[PDB]
Design a protein around this ligand. Structure first.
Ligand code: CLA
Ligand code: CLA
Ligand code: CLA
Ligand code: CLA
Ligand code: CLA
Ligand code: CLA
Ligand code: CLA
Ligand code: A86
Ligand code: A86
Ligand code: A86
Ligand code: LMT
Lengths: 173, 174, 188, 208, 211
């Protein structure tokens, strides 16, 4: 609906297949939090491909035998493979605590409660001027909507060359 | 609704010898006005884009890294499109698609009780709010676009069949 | 009234949320057994004993596979505790038989306390009066939380102790290096 | 919150209250908004007070100011023979660094424990005097703020204006000391300090 | 809206009120029409009064410069090169940032409203009016005012300024295309005069070191 944030100027509310009424009100509330989490993950994913695809990398050693010199030498989609198994165990473990904490809030966002806020560091963001947070929620979703197309373009360019015309002769792809 | 819309002029009052306005519903006529106007605006850019590309005037200086603007100014404009790069035509087909996707999904569609498609980017649309002045202006858009629809069909009947028009087909561009 | 854990099923009638880990999870109706010396008292005492034995077995594995065996038992040297038992039995078998008869006297007394505690009503199932620090004296809401935390950690450790037996008797490695093997095998 | 707007209006009558991130309306540890707004005031005052001693302390320790006498049992003077003051913090010792840090750590401790706290009835930045509060068993002669007594007798309106020109000189020296250390690791980072700053090129944000 | 058409009664009664794009009834950024009609009024006032400031900056910067120092490095001017459009590049870059710092601060004071002394032009104030420096002068140090730093005017009657406001933007929009008859007269020029000027940086606005 239009009183919800993600409705904007060009297409708002954009729902041609009428997926918002395919379930109840709690289904749409699950759809919003999943769009918000797909957005935040892809914005970190579009930037993580753009940063590691250039050659920007941390100085030093990632582990005892794997430096950042060797991981930036590869394209990013297979740079995850040479991360140590104790390295992905540290990453996936803190995401597990992050996903468990934002689910275990006292009211679920599917039942009207809050969407996932920051876990560590746990800055409060409640009384941050609902008019300004309305515009910034739209820019979170719109930058999420664009980055989800972007990271799906980056994987499609990395395996099927010529799928996107702007990334054909790109050496990171 | 065909009495209450623009397009009615002084030589032919309501020109409909096949009565195709009242053939369908008002959504069928609203599709027809949205298709006359879209064919008008494409053919008006088509008649202009044929004449200023047959006049030889062009942008400076390189369209692609390999294709110059001046190499497409020498050939006919209907054969210049074959020499536009495939990545450039994909850039054109994407922005045309994203404009057609937006105008058919902006709220209260034209086949319903809604407005005809306006400027996608940037959204201003320059329209006069005076209904006695605006009605004549969109009467001017239609029959200028009606003449441009006949004009661009004359440009492709002169570039395919040699002859077919007296004031053309002597010209190495048309 | 429906079960909390299985909301398509009716609630089992002898489970009313009085015990600690009661969310109505009895689909087979085993709490309705009342015949071959077995009832809800016997099953709750069996659950609580399976809870406490498995809880001690998990940390009893994780103590030796991290810090080694106790002094006097340094002849083990195997991280697989299903194999390290047979090296202690190979050299000092008398202490295992000391514990196994000391368990035998304790368990036969606990078997009398279960059946006399069932015929009378002066003993909760799994209750032995072993509260020497005295957590049960005050804050009955905070004491029912400890009763639920015993059951919740004990039901979890039942899977863990049964797994460490079975994936110790089949891989012959040890629990923590079965865990490192699985981490490198299923990494993505 | 009502007094934070009244403070920042007096610091700048053009820019009355500036908050892009709206950090002034948050909590941190679930206290309340009015208690963390004294945390934010304390942390801004402490950041500016440290940076403004750091800016004077930079230009003294960047030029050759090695004062006698060296206070050691073997020799080992103040290591200005590099010079380049981010290098000169590294060349102290390893064990001399814990004496500097833990002594400031008492003043960080005493500002929290003693007379009244900034996440309460406030006055942030007000260092409690060592004469009172009965926690230190020495006792010590002087206080941190007014050791010689300069200047008691100033009215409230004379000292209410003091923190407002301490906050504005504290905000500028935050920018001031960081513009030095940015050129110690990337040059061209500040445009008007090219060539002056000798590119320490290590890690300024690590003690040992 | 109606007060805009009142200015066109005073500007050119032969032509009259004239919007071909009909922007006097549109709205920008969803902020309404009455804010849009004052953004449009301030923009061509600021377009005109910059162009009149550049029209006289094109007729004396060709013919007369002050010669003294220009920098602390010698070569003590960009060495005209009487074509004024081409004198901007070699000024150098360190001087262009100082120009772009004051105009960034001067236009920051305009949309401020003078620290809140005047209202905003989209919400009420007269569009050509620059807010005075009276609240900066009251606090930091004596700075001169932007419009009339000495107090020559405020001797006028009130009916004379609106006959000079209408003279200002009428002189403004002629100098908008008047100054665009000079830098457009240097790249495939197109005019009857011939001869004024020739050069080819053509626009926009900095040169060899950036991006
Ligand atoms: C092809 C695009 C197109 C479309 C969608 C329309 C649609 C319309 N015209 Mg327009 N018209 C067009 C082209 C078009 N016209 C051209 C090129 C001319 C100049 C000859 C005109 C001259 C004209 C006048 C003077 C008037 C209209 C009017 C109308 C409206 C009347 C309803 C109707 O009968 O629909 C038409 C139904 C259609 C399905 C569109 C026709 C397409 C046909 C069926 C395809 C076959 C044509 C055939 C191949 C001949 C073309 C030869 C070619 C080589 C040149 C309707 C909105 C009237 C109006 O606006 O009333 C207010 C009106 O008075 N038209
Ligand atoms: C994770 C995917 C995802 C999800 C769950 C949502 C969910 C939502 N979107 Mg969002 N959207 C997305 C991605 C997603 N979107 C992307 C990538 C874009 C850019 C194209 C948009 C652009 C967009 C706009 C402009 C608007 C929405 C709106 C909405 C709300 C619409 C109501 C509804 O029930 O739709 C449910 C949606 C789904 C169940 C999506 C699941 C995926 C479907 C089933 C298949 C898609 C496959 C697709 C064809 C592959 C294309 C590849 C791609 C790279 C192009 C809902 C919360 C509206 C809104 O925010 O109102 C509050 C709104 O105005 N979306
Ligand atoms: C030059 C730039 C710069 C900037 C932008 C800041 C800004 C800040 N610093 Mg400062 N700081 C600076 C220079 C700077 N500082 C320098 C040069 C030093 C060395 C002298 C310090 C040393 C310093 C200390 C000791 C402290 C600060 C704190 C702060 C924050 C005060 C406001 C606040 O509480 O927000 C809320 C805070 C944030 C938005 C920051 C989020 C931090 C995330 C969540 C990570 C937390 C990691 C942390 C180590 C966890 C420890 C506990 C955990 C193990 C359980 C603010 C973000 C204070 C602070 O953050 O307290 C809350 C604080 O205690 N700074
Ligand atoms: C430089 C930035 C920019 C971009 C990315 C676009 C993009 C677009 N414009 Mg364009 N437009 C622009 C500047 C731009 N415009 C300017 C400066 C003007 C003059 C004011 C226009 C006047 C204009 C008109 C009249 C129309 C477009 C339309 C469009 C859409 C399709 C046209 C196309 O394929 O190209 C497309 C989204 C079309 C649109 O919105 O309608 C479907 C259309 O009719 N534009
Ligand atoms: C399921 C429980 C269990 C079992 C079967 C074992 C068995 C073993 N342990 Mg392990 N261990 C356990 C739990 C267990 N442990 C716990 C909880 C810890 C602390 C975390 C350890 C820490 C540990 C270390 C450091 C070492 C062992 C070692 C051993 C082996 C030789 C020790 C021995 O035989 O003692 C003989 C038995 C006794 C001396 C008496 C047993 C206890 C009696 C029966 C009292 C029980 C009271 C009961 C718990 C509560 C009251 C019951 C009732 C009143 C309600 C043997 C296979 C050694 C080894 O060889 O490793 C390879 C070794 O070095 N254990
Ligand atoms: C901002 C905090 C700060 C820090 C961490 C340092 C750190 C240092 N100072 Mg510096 N200094 C500072 C501010 C600071 N200074 C200020 C504000 C002044 C002017 C009073 C000086 C004047 C100064 C001199 C003359 C000398 C040092 C020296 C030193 C170095 C070792 C001896 C020492 O710790 O003296 C203890 C610190 C002080 C005596 C300064 C007191 C700082 C308080 C806050 C100001 C109150 C007075 C060490 C790197 C010595 C050296 O050998 O350099 C290589 C040395 O000879 N400092
Ligand atoms: C429909 C026809 C029409 C009408 C009725 C008007 C009416 C008006 N015009 Mg407009 N205008 C028109 C067409 C028209 N104009 C055209 C075609 C042009 C382009 C040339 C202009 C450009 C124009 C400007 C720039 C201005 C006007 C102004 C005016 C108003 C006062 C004019 C006056 O009498 O002051 C008396 C006339 C003078 C005092 C002459 C002033 C001469 C100046 C100061 C010097 C000009 C340089 C000179 C030509 C050469 C100097 C020597 C040289 C060799 C160096 C009046 C409402 C003025 C205004 O809006 O103020 C209310 C105003 O500033 N007009
Ligand atoms: C109160 C306050 O003040 O704060 C508020 C207000 C304020 C200031 C407004 C804020 C803001 C706005 C901000 C910070 C906006 C910044 C946005 C940003 C940072 C936008 C990056 C785009 C980069 C792209 C698209 C790269 C494409 C690159 C592509 C496609 C490549 O091929 C990369 C490349 O390497 C390779 C992979 C391959 C090579 O062959 C080619 C190269 C080398 C090129 C805050 C901070 O949010 C909040
Ligand atoms: C366009 C816009 O909206 O902008 C907005 C954006 C934004 C971000 C939202 C806002 C904000 C908050 C900001 C800007 C926060 C940044 C704060 C900043 C810049 C804080 C540094 C403090 C330095 C410290 C603590 C220590 C120095 C350390 C010192 C002095 C020492 O320890 C000693 C030493 O030096 C010597 C003395 C001697 C040497 O031998 C050794 C060393 C070198 C170690 C604003 C205000 O709204 C503005
Ligand atoms: C054609 C011609 O003849 O001209 C010639 C001559 C000449 C004159 C030399 C020319 C020139 C020079 C020109 C025109 C140069 C450009 C000028 C221009 C117009 C430059 C815009 C800057 C905008 C900024 C920095 C935005 C900040 C905005 C920010 C940071 C924000 O939005 C965020 C914020 O505000 C909010 C939204 C919300 C708050 O919670 C937080 C804050 C406060 C942080 C040319 C072009 O070269 C050629
Ligand atoms: C509101 C409206 C929104 C409209 C959005 C429109 C976005 C347009 C983005 C276009 C970006 C073009 O990006 C560019 O693509 C071209 C192909 O055309 C690539 O061009 C490259 O590949 C093509 C083949 O595919 C070669 O012919 C060409 O020689 C080579 O340089 C460029 O490497 C890339 O930089």
């Amino acid at each position: 609906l239009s009183s919800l944030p993600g409705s904007t100027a060009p297409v708002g509310p954009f729902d041609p297949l009428n997926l918002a009424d395919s379930g109840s009100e709690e289904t749409l509330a699950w759809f919003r939090a999943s769009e918000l989490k797909h957005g935040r993950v892809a914005m970190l994913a579009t930037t993580g491909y753009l940063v590691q695809g250039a050659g920007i990398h941390f100085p030093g050693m990632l582990s005892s035998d794997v430096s950042f010199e060797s991981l930036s030498a590869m394209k990013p989609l297979e740079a995850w493979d040479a991360v140590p198994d104790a390295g992905k165990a540290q990453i996936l473990g803190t995401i597990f605590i992050a996903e468990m904490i934002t689910e275990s809030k006292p009211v679920h966002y599917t039942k009207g409660g809050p969407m996932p806020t920051m876990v560590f560091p746990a800055i409060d963001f409640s009384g941050v001027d609902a008019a300004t947070l309305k515009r910034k929620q739209d820019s979170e979703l719109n930058n999420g909507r664009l980055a989800m197309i972007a990271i799906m373009s980056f994987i499609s360019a990395a395996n099927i060359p010529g799928s996107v015309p702007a990334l054909t002769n790109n050496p990171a792809f | 609704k065909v009495d209450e819309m623009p397009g009615a002029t002084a030589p032919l009052g309501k020109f409909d010898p096949l009565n195709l306005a009242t053939l369908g519903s008002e959504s069928t006529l609203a599709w027809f006005r949205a298709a006359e106007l879209k064919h008008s605006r494409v053919a008006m850019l088509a008649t202009t884009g044929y004449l200023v590309q047959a006049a030889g005037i062009h942008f400076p200086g390189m369209l692609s890294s390999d294709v110059s603007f001046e190499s497409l100014s020498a050939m006919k404009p209907l054969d210049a499109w074959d020499a536009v790069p495939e990545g450039g035509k994909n850039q054109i087909y994407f922005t045309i698609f994203l404009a057609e996707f937006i105008t058919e999904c902006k709220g209260t569609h034209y086949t319903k009780g809604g407005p005809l498609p306006t400027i996608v980017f940037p959204p201003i649309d320059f329209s006069t709010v005076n209904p006695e002045q605006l009605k004549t202006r969109q009467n001017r858009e239609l029959n200028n676009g009606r003449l441009a629809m006949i004009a661009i069909m004359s440009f492709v009947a002169a570039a395919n069949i040699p002859g077919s028009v007296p004031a053309l087909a002597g010209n190495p561009m048309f | 009234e429906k079960s909390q854990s299985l909301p398509f099923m009716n609630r089992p009638p002898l489970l009313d949320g009085s015990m600690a880990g009661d969310v109505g999870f009895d689909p087979l109706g085993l709490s309705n057994i009342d015949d071959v010396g077995i009832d809800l008292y016997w099953l709750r005492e069996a659950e609580i004993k399976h809870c406490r034995v498995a809880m001690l077995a998990v940390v009893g594995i994780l103590q030796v596979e991290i810090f080694g065996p106790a002094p006097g038992c340094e002849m083990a040297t195997d991280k697989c505790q299903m194999d390290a038992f047979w090296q202690i039995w190979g050299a000092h078998p008398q202490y295992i038989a000391f514990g196994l008869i000391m368990i035998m006297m304790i368990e036969m007394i606990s078997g009398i306390a279960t059946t006399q505690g069932r015929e009378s009503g002066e003993r909760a199932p799994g209750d032995f009066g072993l509260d020497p620090l005295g957590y049960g004296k005050g804050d009955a809401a905070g004491y029912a939380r400890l009763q639920a935390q015993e059951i919740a950690n004990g039901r979890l450790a039942m899977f863990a102790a049964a797994g460490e037996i079975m994936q110790g008797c089949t891989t012959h490695q040890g629990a923590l290096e079965n865990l490192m093997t699985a981490l490198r095998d299923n990494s993505f | 919150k009502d007094d934070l707007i009244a403070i920042a209006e007096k610091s700048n009558p053009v820019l009355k209250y500036y908050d892009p991130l709206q950090l002034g309306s948050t909590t941190i540890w679930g206290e309340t908004n009015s208690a963390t707004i004294g945390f934010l005031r304390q942390s801004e005052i402490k950041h500016g007070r440290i940076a403004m001693a750091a800016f004077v302390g930079y230009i003294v320790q960047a030029n050759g100011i090695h004062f006698p006498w060296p206070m050691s049992f073997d020799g080992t003077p103040f290591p200005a023979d590099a010079g380049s003051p981010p290098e000169q913090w590294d060349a102290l010792s390893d064990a001399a660094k814990w004496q500097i840090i833990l002594f400031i750590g008492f003043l960080e401790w005493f500002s929290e424990a003693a007379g009244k706290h900034y996440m309460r009835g406030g006055k942030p930045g007000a260092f409690p005097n060592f004469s009172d509060s009965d926690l230190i068993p020495h006792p010590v002669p002087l206080n941190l703020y007014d050791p010689f007594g300069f200047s008691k007798g100033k009215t409230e309106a004379q000292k209410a204006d003091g923190l407002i020109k301490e906050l504005n000189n504290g905000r500028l020296a935050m920018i001031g000391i960081m513009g030095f250390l940015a050129e110690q690791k990337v040059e061209g980072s500040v445009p008007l300090l090219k060539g002056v700053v000798p590119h320490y090129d290590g890690e300024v944000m690590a003690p040992f | 809206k109606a007060e805009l058409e009142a200015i066109a009664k005073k500007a050119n009664p032969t032509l009259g009120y004239y919007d071909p794009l009909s922007l006097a009834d549109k709205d920008f950024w969803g902020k309404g029409n009455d804010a849009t009609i004052a953004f449009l009024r301030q923009s061509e006032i600021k377009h005109g009064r910059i162009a009149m400031f550049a029209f006289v900056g094109y007729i004396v910067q060709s013919n007369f410069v002050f010669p003294w120092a220009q920098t602390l490095a010698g070569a003590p001017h960009p060495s005209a090169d009487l074509s004024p459009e081409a004198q901007w590049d070699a000024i150098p870059l360190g001087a262009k940032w100082q120009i772009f710092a004051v105009i960034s601060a001067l236009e920051l004071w305009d949309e401020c409203g003078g620290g809140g002394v005047l209202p905003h032009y989209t919400k009420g104030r007269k569009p050509g009016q620059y807010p005075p420096f009276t609240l900066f002068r009251d606090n930091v140090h004596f700075v001169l005012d932007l419009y009339d730093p000495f107090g020559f005017n405020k001797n006028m009657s009130e009916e004379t300024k609106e006959r000079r406001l209408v003279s200002e933007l009428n002189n403004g929009r002629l100098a908008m295309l008047g100054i665009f008859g000079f830098l457009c007269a240097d790249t495939i020029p197109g005019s009857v005069p011939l001869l004024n000027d020739i050069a080819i940086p053509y626009s926009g606005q900095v040169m060899q070191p950036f991006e």
